[PDB]
Short mmCIF file of C-alpha atoms in Angstrom, two decimals:
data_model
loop_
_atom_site.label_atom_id
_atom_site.label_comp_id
_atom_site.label_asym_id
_atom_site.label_seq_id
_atom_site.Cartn_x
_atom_site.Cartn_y
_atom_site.Cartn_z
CA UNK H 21 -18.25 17.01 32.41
CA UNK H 22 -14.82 16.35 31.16
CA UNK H 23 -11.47 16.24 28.58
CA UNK H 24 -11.67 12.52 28.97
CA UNK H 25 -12.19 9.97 31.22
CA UNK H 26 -10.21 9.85 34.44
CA UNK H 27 -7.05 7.43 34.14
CA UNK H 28 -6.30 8.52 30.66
CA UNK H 29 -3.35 10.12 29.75
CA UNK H 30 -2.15 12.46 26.49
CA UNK H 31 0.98 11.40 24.74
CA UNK H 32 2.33 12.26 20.93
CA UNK H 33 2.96 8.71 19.19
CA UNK H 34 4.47 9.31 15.44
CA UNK H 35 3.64 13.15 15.88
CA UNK H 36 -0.08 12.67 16.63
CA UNK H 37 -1.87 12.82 20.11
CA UNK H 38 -3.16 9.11 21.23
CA UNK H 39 -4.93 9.30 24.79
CA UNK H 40 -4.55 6.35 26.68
CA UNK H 41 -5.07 4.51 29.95
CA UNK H 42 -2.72 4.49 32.40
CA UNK H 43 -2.34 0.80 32.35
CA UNK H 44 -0.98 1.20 28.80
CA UNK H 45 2.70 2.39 29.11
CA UNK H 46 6.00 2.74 26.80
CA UNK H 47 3.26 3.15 23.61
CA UNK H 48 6.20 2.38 20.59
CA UNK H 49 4.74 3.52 16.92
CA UNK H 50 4.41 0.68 14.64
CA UNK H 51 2.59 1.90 11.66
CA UNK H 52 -0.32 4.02 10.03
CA UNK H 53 -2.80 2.73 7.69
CA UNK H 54 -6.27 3.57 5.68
CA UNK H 55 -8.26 3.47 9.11
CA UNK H 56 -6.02 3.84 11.81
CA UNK H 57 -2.13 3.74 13.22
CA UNK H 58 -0.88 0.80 14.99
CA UNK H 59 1.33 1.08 18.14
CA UNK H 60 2.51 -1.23 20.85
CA UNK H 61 2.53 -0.58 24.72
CA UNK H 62 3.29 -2.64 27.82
CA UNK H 63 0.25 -3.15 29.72
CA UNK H 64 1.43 -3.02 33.24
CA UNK H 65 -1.12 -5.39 34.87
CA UNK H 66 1.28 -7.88 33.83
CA UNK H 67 4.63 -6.88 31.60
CA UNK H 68 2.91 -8.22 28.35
CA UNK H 69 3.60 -6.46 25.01
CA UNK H 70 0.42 -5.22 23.04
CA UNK H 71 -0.54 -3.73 19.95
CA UNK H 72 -3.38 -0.80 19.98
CA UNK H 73 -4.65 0.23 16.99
CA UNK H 74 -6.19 4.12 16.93
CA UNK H 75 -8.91 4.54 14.85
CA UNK H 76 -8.77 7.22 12.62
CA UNK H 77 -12.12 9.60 12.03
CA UNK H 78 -14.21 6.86 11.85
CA UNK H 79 -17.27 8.95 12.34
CA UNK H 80 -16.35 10.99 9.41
CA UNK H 81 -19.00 9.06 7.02
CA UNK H 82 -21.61 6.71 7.54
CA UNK H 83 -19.34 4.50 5.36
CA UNK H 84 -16.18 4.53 7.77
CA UNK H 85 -18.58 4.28 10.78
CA UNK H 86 -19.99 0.90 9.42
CA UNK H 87 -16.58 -0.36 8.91
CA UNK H 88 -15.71 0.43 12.14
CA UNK H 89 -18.02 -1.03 13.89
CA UNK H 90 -18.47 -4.40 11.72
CA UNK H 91 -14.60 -4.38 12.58
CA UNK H 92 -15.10 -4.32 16.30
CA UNK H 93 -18.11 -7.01 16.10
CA UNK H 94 -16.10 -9.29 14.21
CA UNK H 95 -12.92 -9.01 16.54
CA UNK H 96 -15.46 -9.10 19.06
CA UNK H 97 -16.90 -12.51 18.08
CA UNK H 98 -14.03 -14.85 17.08
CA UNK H 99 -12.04 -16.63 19.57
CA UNK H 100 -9.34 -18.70 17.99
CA UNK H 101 -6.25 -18.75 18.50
CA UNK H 102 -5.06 -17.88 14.19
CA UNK H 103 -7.69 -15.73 14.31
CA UNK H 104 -6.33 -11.53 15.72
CA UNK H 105 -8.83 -11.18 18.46
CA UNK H 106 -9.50 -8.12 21.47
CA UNK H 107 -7.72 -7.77 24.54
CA UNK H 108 -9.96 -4.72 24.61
CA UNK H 109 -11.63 -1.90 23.95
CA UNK H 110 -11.41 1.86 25.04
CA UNK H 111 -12.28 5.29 24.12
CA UNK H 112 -11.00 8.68 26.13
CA UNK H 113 -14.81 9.86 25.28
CA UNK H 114 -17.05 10.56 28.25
CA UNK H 115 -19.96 11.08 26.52
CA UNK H 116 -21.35 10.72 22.87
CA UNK H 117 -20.83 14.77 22.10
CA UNK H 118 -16.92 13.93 22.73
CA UNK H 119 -16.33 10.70 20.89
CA UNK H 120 -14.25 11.21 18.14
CA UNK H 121 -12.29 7.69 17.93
CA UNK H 122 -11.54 4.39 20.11
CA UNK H 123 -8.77 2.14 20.14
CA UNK H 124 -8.28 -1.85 19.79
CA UNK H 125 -6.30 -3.35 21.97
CA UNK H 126 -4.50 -6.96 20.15
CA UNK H 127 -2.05 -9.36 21.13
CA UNK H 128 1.34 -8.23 19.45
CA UNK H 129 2.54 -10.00 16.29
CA UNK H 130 6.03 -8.90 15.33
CA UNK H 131 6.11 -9.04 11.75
CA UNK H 132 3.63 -10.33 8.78
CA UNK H 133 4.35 -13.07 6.25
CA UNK H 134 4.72 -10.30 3.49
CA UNK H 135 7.42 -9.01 5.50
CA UNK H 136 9.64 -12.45 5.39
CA UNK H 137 8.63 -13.63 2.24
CA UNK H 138 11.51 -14.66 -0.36
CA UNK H 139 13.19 -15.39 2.80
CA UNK H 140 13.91 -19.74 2.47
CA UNK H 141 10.85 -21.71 3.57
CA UNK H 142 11.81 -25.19 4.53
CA UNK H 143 8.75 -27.13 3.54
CA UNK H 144 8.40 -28.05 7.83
CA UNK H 145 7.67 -24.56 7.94
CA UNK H 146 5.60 -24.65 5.13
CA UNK H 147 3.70 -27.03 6.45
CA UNK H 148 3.35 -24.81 10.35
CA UNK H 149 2.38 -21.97 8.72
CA UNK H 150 -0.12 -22.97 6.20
CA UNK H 151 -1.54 -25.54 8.97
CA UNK H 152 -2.37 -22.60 11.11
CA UNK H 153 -3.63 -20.35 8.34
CA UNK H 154 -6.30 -23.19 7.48
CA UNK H 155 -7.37 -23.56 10.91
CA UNK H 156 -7.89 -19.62 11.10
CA UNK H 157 -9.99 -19.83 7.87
CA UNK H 158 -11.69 -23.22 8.75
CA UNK H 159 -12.75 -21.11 12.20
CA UNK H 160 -14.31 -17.79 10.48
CA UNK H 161 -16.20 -19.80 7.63
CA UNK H 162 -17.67 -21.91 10.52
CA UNK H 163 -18.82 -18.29 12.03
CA UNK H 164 -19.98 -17.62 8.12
CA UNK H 165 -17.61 -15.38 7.71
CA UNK H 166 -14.77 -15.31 4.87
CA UNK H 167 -11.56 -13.40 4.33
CA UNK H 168 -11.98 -12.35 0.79
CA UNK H 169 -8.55 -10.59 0.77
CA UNK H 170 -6.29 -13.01 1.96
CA UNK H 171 -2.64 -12.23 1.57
CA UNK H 172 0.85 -12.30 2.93
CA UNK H 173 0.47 -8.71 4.52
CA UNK H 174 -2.64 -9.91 6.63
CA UNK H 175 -0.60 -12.98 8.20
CA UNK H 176 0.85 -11.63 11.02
CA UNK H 177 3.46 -13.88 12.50
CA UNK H 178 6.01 -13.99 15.56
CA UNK H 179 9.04 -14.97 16.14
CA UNK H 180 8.13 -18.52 17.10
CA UNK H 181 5.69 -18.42 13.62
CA UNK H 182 2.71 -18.13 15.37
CA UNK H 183 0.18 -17.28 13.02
CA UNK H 184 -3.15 -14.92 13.14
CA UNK H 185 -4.99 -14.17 10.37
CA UNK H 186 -6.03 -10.02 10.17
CA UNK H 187 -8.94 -8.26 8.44
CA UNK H 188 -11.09 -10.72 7.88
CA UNK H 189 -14.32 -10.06 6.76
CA UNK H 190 -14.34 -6.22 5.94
CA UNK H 191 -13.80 -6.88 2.15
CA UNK H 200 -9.81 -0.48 -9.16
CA UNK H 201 -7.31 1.36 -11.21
CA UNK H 202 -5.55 -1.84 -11.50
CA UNK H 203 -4.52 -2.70 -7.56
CA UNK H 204 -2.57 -6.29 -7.11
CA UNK H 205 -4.89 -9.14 -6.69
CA UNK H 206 -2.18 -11.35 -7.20
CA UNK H 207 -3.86 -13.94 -4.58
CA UNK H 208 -7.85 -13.45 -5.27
CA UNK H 209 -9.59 -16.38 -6.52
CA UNK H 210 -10.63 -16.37 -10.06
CA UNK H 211 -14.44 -16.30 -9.96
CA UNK H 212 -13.79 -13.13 -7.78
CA UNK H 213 -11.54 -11.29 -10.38
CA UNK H 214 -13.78 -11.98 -13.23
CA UNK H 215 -17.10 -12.49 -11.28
CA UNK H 216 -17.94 -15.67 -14.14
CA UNK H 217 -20.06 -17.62 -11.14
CA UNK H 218 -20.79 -17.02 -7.47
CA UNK H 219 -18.17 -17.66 -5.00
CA UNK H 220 -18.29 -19.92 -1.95
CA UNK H 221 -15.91 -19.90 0.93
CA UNK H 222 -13.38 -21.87 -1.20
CA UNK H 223 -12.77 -18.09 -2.14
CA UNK H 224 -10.20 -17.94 0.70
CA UNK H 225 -8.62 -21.47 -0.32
CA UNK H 226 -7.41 -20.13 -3.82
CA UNK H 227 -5.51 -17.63 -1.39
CA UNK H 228 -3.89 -20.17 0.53
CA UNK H 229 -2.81 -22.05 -2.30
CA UNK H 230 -0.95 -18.68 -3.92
CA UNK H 231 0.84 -18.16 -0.81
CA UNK H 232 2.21 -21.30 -0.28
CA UNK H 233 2.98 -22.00 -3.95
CA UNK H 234 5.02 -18.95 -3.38
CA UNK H 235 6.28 -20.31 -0.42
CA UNK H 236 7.47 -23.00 -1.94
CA UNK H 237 9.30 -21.20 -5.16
CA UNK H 238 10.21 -17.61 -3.91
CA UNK H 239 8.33 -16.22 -6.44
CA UNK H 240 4.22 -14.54 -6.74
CA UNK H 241 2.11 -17.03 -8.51
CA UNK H 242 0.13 -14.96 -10.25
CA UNK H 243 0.41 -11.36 -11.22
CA UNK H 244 -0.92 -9.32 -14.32
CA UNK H 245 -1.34 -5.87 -15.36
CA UNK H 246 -4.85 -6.34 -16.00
CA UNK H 247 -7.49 -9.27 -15.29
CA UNK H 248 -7.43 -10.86 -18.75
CA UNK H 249 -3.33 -10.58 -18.65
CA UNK H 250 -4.15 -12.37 -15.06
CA UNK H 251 -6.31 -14.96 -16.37
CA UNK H 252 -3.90 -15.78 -19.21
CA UNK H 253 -1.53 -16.58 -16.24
CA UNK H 254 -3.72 -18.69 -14.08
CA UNK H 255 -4.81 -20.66 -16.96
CA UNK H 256 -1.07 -21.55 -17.44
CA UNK H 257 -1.10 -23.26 -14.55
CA UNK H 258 -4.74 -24.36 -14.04
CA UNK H 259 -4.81 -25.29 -17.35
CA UNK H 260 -7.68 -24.40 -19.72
CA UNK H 261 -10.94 -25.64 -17.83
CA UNK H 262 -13.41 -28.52 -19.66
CA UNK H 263 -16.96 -28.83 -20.33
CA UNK H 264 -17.99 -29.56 -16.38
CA UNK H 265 -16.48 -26.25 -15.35
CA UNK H 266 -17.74 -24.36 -18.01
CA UNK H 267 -21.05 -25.38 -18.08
CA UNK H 268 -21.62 -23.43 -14.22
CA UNK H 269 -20.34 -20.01 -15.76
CA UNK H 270 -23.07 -17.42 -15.69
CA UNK H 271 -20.83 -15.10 -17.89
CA UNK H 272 -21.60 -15.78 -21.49
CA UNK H 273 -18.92 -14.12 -23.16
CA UNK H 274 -16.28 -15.26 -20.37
CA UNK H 275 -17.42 -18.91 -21.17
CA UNK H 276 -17.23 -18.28 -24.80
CA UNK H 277 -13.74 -17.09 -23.93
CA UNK H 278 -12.74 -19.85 -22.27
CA UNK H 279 -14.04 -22.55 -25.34
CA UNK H 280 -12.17 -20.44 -27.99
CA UNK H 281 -8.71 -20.46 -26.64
CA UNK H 282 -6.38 -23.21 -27.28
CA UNK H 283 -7.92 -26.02 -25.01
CA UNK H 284 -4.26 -26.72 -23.17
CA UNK H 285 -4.39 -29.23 -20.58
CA UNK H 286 -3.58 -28.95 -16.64
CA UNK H 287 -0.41 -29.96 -14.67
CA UNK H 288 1.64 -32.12 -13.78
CA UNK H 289 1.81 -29.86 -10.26
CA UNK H 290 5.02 -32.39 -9.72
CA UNK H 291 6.50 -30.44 -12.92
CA UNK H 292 5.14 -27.18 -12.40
CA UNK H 293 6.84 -27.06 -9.27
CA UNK H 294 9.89 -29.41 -9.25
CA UNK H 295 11.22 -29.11 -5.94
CA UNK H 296 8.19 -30.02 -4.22
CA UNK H 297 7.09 -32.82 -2.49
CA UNK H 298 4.59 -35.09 -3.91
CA UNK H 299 1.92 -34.34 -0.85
CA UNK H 300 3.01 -30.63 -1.59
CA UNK H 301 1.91 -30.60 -5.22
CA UNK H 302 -0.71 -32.51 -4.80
CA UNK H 303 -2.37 -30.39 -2.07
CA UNK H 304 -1.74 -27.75 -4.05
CA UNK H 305 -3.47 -28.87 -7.29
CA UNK H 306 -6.30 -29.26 -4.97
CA UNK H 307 -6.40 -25.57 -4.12
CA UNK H 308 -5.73 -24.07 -7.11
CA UNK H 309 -8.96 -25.28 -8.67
CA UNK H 310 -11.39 -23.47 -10.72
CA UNK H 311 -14.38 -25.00 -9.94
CA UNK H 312 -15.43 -23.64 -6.88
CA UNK H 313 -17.44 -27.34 -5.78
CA UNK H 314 -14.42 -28.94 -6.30
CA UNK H 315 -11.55 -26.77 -4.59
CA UNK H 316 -10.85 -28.00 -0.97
CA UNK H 317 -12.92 -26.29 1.89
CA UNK H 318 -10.53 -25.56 4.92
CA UNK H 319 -11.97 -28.70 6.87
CA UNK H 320 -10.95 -30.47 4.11
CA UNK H 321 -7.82 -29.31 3.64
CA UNK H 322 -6.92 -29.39 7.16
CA UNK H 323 -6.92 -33.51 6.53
CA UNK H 324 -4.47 -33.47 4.03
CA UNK H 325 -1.10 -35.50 4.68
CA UNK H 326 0.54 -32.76 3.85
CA UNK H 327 0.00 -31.61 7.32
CA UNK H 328 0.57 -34.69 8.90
CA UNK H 329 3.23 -33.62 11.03
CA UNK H 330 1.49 -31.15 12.78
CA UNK H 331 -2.45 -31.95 12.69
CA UNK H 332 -4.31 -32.02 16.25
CA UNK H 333 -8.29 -32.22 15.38
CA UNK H 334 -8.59 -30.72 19.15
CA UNK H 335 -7.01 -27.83 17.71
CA UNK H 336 -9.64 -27.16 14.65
CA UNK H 337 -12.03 -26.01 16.40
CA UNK H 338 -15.06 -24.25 14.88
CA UNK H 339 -17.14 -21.14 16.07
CA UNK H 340 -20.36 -22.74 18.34
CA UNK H 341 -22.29 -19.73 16.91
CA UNK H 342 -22.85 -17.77 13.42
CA UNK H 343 -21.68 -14.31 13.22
CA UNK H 344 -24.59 -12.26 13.70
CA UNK H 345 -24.71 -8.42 12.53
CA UNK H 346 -28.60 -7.29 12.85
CA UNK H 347 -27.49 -4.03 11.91
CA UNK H 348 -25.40 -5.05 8.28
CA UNK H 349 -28.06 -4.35 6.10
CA UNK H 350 -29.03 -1.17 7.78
CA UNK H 351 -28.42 2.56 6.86
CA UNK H 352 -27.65 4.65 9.56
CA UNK H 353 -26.62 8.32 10.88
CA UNK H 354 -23.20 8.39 11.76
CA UNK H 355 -24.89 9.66 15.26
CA UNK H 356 -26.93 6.61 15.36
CA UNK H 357 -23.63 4.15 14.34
CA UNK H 358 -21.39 6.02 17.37
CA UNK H 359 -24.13 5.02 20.09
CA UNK H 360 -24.18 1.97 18.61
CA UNK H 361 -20.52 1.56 18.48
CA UNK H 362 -20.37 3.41 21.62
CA UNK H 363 -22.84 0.88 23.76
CA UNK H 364 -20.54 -2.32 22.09
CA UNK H 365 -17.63 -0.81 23.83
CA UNK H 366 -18.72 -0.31 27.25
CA UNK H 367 -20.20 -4.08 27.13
CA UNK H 368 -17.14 -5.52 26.31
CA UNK H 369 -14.96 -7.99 28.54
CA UNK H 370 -11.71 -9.42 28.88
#
């Protein structure tokens, strides 16, 4: 019968209470968010900087609680090295009655690509970056898994440019969805995992010019701007759209041709361009896979096969289809944490 388990302490961490082990020291706020705050602590076993992450009421709905743990399964499952993984796991809770939270405990990445973007990307750094985010994404659609909501903000990076891809997997007024593919924004055919690869290619095209890609105050505004670059898709595209009226759309604008990617963006290389006219695709059995992509000469400099390494088994949530009680999601949530090893 107690507080919390022994070897935690209380502290205040951006004026709320986080309970901790005592193995975590110094914890630094970092940031709050829609499910949780993030801070960073040095674990003494060894000096090393971490990020936790709190969780915030996730046992408030049966909807938060199957976020929560689908989160912690995923995290749980990959191990790649662009890909955030656990460190660990804890909760202060000594029984189910008192479990209220738990916290993730993450390798620290100081900053996020959202956070240095606009700053001057040498294409070499280009190419580092977007070689690593492509093994990240090659990695989780080998587990079956896809992003969905790939974007600057969840590519954390250090110092050195390290790469790992975050929140992966979890996936109205008019929110940005500056860097979602296409088939997503207008739903006009199922997507694949190329879903991701439209993603990739945004980010590096803006990357390359400083400047978003593609924005839009609403999705036909969006489309109008895609198709500017994409150009105005022929009669093998069209013919796999299960939208009727977006496909009568499409044959009743001005039919304006693609490209030249060398033109559109002028300062790139030609292995540049042409990767990314092979990303921004809208026909979703055409656009590169990650595998694929990973091939390209554009990458040259950097490519090590060793490194693309691909999950040995599919992710593998019994439970995803299943309602719940929020009682019956904490044990469940509550047995994955004790099991867990670093």
């Amino acid at each position: 019968s107690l507080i919390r388990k022994k070897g935690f302490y209380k502290q205040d961490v951006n004026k709320t209470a986080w309970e901790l082990p005592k193995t975590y020291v110094s914890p630094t706020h970092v940031g709050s968010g829609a499910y949780g705050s993030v801070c960073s602590a040095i674990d003494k076993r060894s000096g090393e900087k971490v990020a936790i992450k709190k969780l915030s009421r996730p046992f408030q709905s049966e909807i938060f609680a199957k976020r929560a743990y689908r989160e912690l399964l995923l995290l749980k499952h990959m191990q790649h090295e662009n890909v955030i993984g656990l460190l660990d796991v804890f909760t202060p809770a000594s029984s189910l009655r008192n479990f209220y939270d738990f916290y993730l405990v993450m390798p620290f990445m100081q900053t996020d690509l959202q956070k240095i973007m606009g700053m001057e990307f040498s294409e070499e750094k280009i190419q580092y970056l977007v070689y690593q985010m492509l093994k990240g994404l090659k990695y989780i659609h080998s587990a079956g898994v896809v992003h969905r909501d790939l974007k600057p903000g969840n590519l954390a990076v250090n110092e050195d440019c390290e790469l790992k891809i975050l929140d992966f997997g979890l996936a109205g007024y008019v929110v940005t969805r500056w860097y979602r593919a296409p088939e997503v924004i207008l739903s006009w055919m199922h997507y694949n995992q190329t879903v991701d690869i439209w993603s990739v290619g945004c980010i590096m095209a803006e990357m390359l010019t400083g400047k978003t890609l593609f924005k839009g105050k609403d999705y036909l505004d969006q489309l109008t701007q895609i198709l500017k670059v994409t150009g105005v898709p022929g009669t093998e595209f069209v013919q796999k759209l299960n939208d009727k009226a977006a496909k009568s759309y499409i044959q009743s604008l001005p039919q304006t041709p693609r490209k030249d990617f060398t033109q559109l963006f002028p300062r790139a290389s030609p292995q540049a361009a042409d990767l990314l006219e092979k990303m921004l695709e809208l026909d979703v059995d055409k656009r590169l896979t990650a595998a694929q992509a990973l091939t390209h000469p554009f990458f040259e400099p950097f490519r090590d096969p060793e490194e693309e390494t691909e999950a040995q088994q599919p992710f593998d949530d019994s439970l995803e289809h299943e309602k719940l009680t929020v009682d019956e999601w904490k044990q469940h949530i509550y047995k994955e944490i004790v099991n867990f090893s670093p």
